[PDB]
């Protein structure tokens, strides 16, 4: 009885926080500040999820009844939550089934894509920082104004430590390992390009796909030279185009991850709302 009102308040708390999170994700450019806010909102959602998980265990073992009408509301719950109403399951089971749905959506959807977005964002921010410093490695060169001199080795090392830094940082899961079949199944449902399956000791992991940065490093290797190379403006333009093309690729990959994260919020929002309606009807 008191649990219900506590749970209903906890559920609305989760709804507002979720909406604040969605505003953070619709922003054009995710900054370090943006990631910090996203992190806070997520830890708040987990705080109320645990609070909810304990109130539902109470309702489950007490066998608080969810009346016919109230159960039918659950049919509006998102298909991802795997909540249907009524048919034949006890009050104990339904309360537990609701707690699992909240926790599973938060653990397998929210937290997962919140980490993926965080990982790829941090990498892209460091990548964009290298591109911002690109003029530092470019010099006039030839005395006619038709050439430019590129510090190929410096720029090469800069991109290679970028790769070294995120070479291991996984997209999914944030820490643990996963079976080959499941790591592939998470990658196949992501978009193939963003991530790569890699064996992290006893198990597997979906790690950041470094092909965009490997493509840039190979463009630099194909320039030759021994530290510095003189490029005519036409060749500089061609090379520079390749670099900006991979920036668009990674920008695109990041937008895809943020969309998966955004889609997860929509799932969670739909569930929490439906649960509030069901709670209010008991």
């Amino acid at each position: 009885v008191s649990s219900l009102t506590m749970l209903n308040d906890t559920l609305h708390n989760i709804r507002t926080t979720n909406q604040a999170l969605k505003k953070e994700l619709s922003q054009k450019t995710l900054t370090k500040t943006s990631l910090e806010e996203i992190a806070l909102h997520s830890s708040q959602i987990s705080m109320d999820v645990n609070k909810s998980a304990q109130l539902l265990d109470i309702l489950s073992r007490n066998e608080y009844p969810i009346n016919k009408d109230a159960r039918e509301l659950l049919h509006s719950a998102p298909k991802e939550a795997e909540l249907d109403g009524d048919q034949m399951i006890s009050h104990r089971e339904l309360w537990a089934k609701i707690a699992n749905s909240i926790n599973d959506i938060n653990e397998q959807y929210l937290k997962v894509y919140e980490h993926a977005v965080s990982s790829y964002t941090q990498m892209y921010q460091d990548f964009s920082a290298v591109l911002s410093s690109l003029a530092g490695w470019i010099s006039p060169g030839g005395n006619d104004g038709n050439s430019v001199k590129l510090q190929v080795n410096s720029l090469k090392k800069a991109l290679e430590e970028l790769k070294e830094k995120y070479k291991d940082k996984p997209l999914y899961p944030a820490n643990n390992t996963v079976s080959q079949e499941q790591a592939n199944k998470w990658l196949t449902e992501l978009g193939g390009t963003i991530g790569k399956v890699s064996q992290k000791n006893g198990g597997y992991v979906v790690s950041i796909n470094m092909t965009p940065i490997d493509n840039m490093l190979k463009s630099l290797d194909n320039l030759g030279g021994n530290g510095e190379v003189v490029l005519d403006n036409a060749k500089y333009q061609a090379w520079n185009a390749g670099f900006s093309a991979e920036d668009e690729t990674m920008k695109n990959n990041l937008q895809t991850l943020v969309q998966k994260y955004s889609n997860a919020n929509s799932i969670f929002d739909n569930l929490v709302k439906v649960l509030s309606s069901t709670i209010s009807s008991s």
Partner: nanobody
Amino acid sequence: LQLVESGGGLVQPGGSLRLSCAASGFTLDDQPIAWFRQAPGKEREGVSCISIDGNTQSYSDSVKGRFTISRDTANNRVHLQMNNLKPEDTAVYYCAADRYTSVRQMCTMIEGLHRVWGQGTQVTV
């Protein structure tokens, strides 16, 4: 296709000017933009530059801290806010477009890369 500067004129030491780069049949947003200046009998030098996305700005050594470059994508313009104008800055100021570069976070002051130039506006201190 025309690059076009404005905002010049005669000011005294410690004063300020706000140069503007505008264009016809040409969007300054499509490539990096730089400001050059040339005193009457000296070599043309670079002053500052701004990247395509506007989040990156560079300034020559003899200009840092005092000047500020920004983009006005709304009206398709680039501004150069020159503050505490010391007498050395007397020169014709040009804004130029580097059409070779396509990376959006970078900008250079290399004259050879800029092939679209404005007429220039006189500044005197």
